[PDB]
Design an enzyme around this catalytic site. Sequence first.
Site, mmCIF file in Angstrom:
data_model
loop_
_atom_site.group_PDB
_atom_site.id
_atom_site.type_symbol
_atom_site.label_atom_id
_atom_site.label_comp_id
_atom_site.label_asym_id
_atom_site.label_seq_id
_atom_site.Cartn_x
_atom_site.Cartn_y
_atom_site.Cartn_z
ATOM 1 N N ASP A 1 0.929 -1.530 0.186
ATOM 2 C CA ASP A 1 0.135 0.074 0.294
ATOM 3 C C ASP A 1 0.788 1.276 -0.102
ATOM 4 O O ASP A 1 0.679 2.186 0.286
ATOM 5 C CB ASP A 1 -0.733 0.081 1.307
ATOM 6 C CG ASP A 1 -2.152 1.070 0.918
ATOM 7 O OD1 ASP A 1 -2.481 1.573 2.415
ATOM 8 O OD2 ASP A 1 -2.245 1.048 -0.469
ATOM 9 N N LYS B 1 1.310 4.889 -0.825
ATOM 10 C CA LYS B 1 0.823 6.006 -1.496
ATOM 11 C C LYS B 1 1.481 6.738 -0.543
ATOM 12 O O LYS B 1 1.934 6.324 1.255
ATOM 13 C CB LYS B 1 -0.207 5.683 -1.674
ATOM 14 C CG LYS B 1 -1.348 5.558 -0.435
ATOM 15 C CD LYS B 1 -2.226 4.948 -0.495
ATOM 16 C CE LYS B 1 -2.695 4.447 0.597
ATOM 17 N NZ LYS B 1 -4.380 4.039 0.357
ATOM 18 N N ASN C 1 0.123 7.248 3.620
ATOM 19 C CA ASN C 1 0.982 6.417 3.880
ATOM 20 C C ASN C 1 2.366 6.311 4.412
ATOM 21 O O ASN C 1 2.962 5.700 5.256
ATOM 22 C CB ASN C 1 0.627 4.735 3.495
ATOM 23 C CG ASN C 1 -0.681 4.485 3.532
ATOM 24 O OD1 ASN C 1 -1.502 5.353 4.287
ATOM 25 N ND2 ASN C 1 -0.284 2.887 3.034
ATOM 26 N N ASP D 1 1.360 2.645 8.368
ATOM 27 C CA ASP D 1 -0.194 1.961 7.608
ATOM 28 C C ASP D 1 0.185 0.202 7.459
ATOM 29 O O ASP D 1 0.610 0.767 6.676
ATOM 30 C CB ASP D 1 -1.194 2.503 7.215
ATOM 31 C CG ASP D 1 -2.728 1.644 7.151
ATOM 32 O OD1 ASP D 1 -2.510 0.632 6.709
ATOM 33 O OD2 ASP D 1 -3.146 2.579 5.465
ATOM 34 N N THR E 1 -4.403 -0.254 -3.558
ATOM 35 C CA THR E 1 -4.998 1.642 -4.146
ATOM 36 C C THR E 1 -4.734 1.446 -5.308
ATOM 37 O O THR E 1 -3.862 1.576 -6.045
ATOM 38 C CB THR E 1 -4.304 2.243 -2.887
ATOM 39 O OG1 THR E 1 -4.363 2.456 -1.783
ATOM 40 C CG2 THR E 1 -5.080 3.838 -3.726
#
Lengths: 353, 13
Positions: A169, A171, A174, A187, A204
Amino acid sequence: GHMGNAAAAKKGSEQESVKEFLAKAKEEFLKKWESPSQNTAQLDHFDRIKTLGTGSFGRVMLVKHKETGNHYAMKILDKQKVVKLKQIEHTLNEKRILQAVNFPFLVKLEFSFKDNSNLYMVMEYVPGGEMFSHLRRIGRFSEPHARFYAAQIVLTFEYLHSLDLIYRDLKPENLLIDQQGYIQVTDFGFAKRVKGRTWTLCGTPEYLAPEIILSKGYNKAVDWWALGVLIYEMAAGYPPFFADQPIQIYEKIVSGKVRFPSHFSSDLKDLLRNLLQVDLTKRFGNLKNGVNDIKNHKWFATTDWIAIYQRKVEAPFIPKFKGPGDTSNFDDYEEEEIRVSINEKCGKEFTEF
Amino acid sequence: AGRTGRRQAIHDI
């Protein structure tokens, strides 16, 4: 060749030292992975201050430990919102991984516990805010600034992948910015220990590798694709596969030719073509030379990898900090009181937490 | 044109 005799010897020795570090890091991780900790605090030990972010299952709040006065970030998950099978498994992954890892750019978990209604994870508070909001405010980062953050991600993924952990994840939302301007990955909700392939369709949209979208069994190379998306977004101000709806994003990822802003250097475009590579036999990070194809790329030629790890490099941006517990670098969110039911919810599904 | 706000991650589908 590209390197003379002295440079090649220095680089080889550096690479062997990395192997030595990772072997010791795996030994430390496995001890904690095989012997996790649980129930190290309870809710009434903290004063809840402000919501710092929200997700589908709950929120992250700034809290203050009553006895010690230390501030922490508390992630709260409503057990009755963590309903789907993969949502449950992912929550157990997250806690077990966070309690076992140790790296300078990974957020440190302090406590975890559960009650009748919620799961709680209490981590170090990182007051400089999300990379996301700094990036949106300024527009884009210059290449040296993006490269400083990217190097931290490369080292963090080299660490995680050596432990057979995929992050899944990456991005800007985070990535938090600490008081020295360095990154803290938070996260771990999609992180997973994977010894070869895995199959969950998760992540995502803008950051998904094509093999995830195509329902293929996939491996840690999805994190290297995501690094390509992150570097592109940091340097451009928007990600490479950009559309209003997820289905349109997916079509661009699998079948779209990446276009680059005219201000991207050719070195950056070359790195990005090799990370945003649909062919897994050609994607950097996934070849015989592993992470070294990335670390030795021309775009990273000015990066002192050891100095980044040791946090010896002056950061491009230091967040303003007004004291402990300051929340000025975070956006505001609607507050909702934490209600704890008199009856235990989903006790069997969360026994291991 | 594309998404400029915070992006939710999806667990399934």
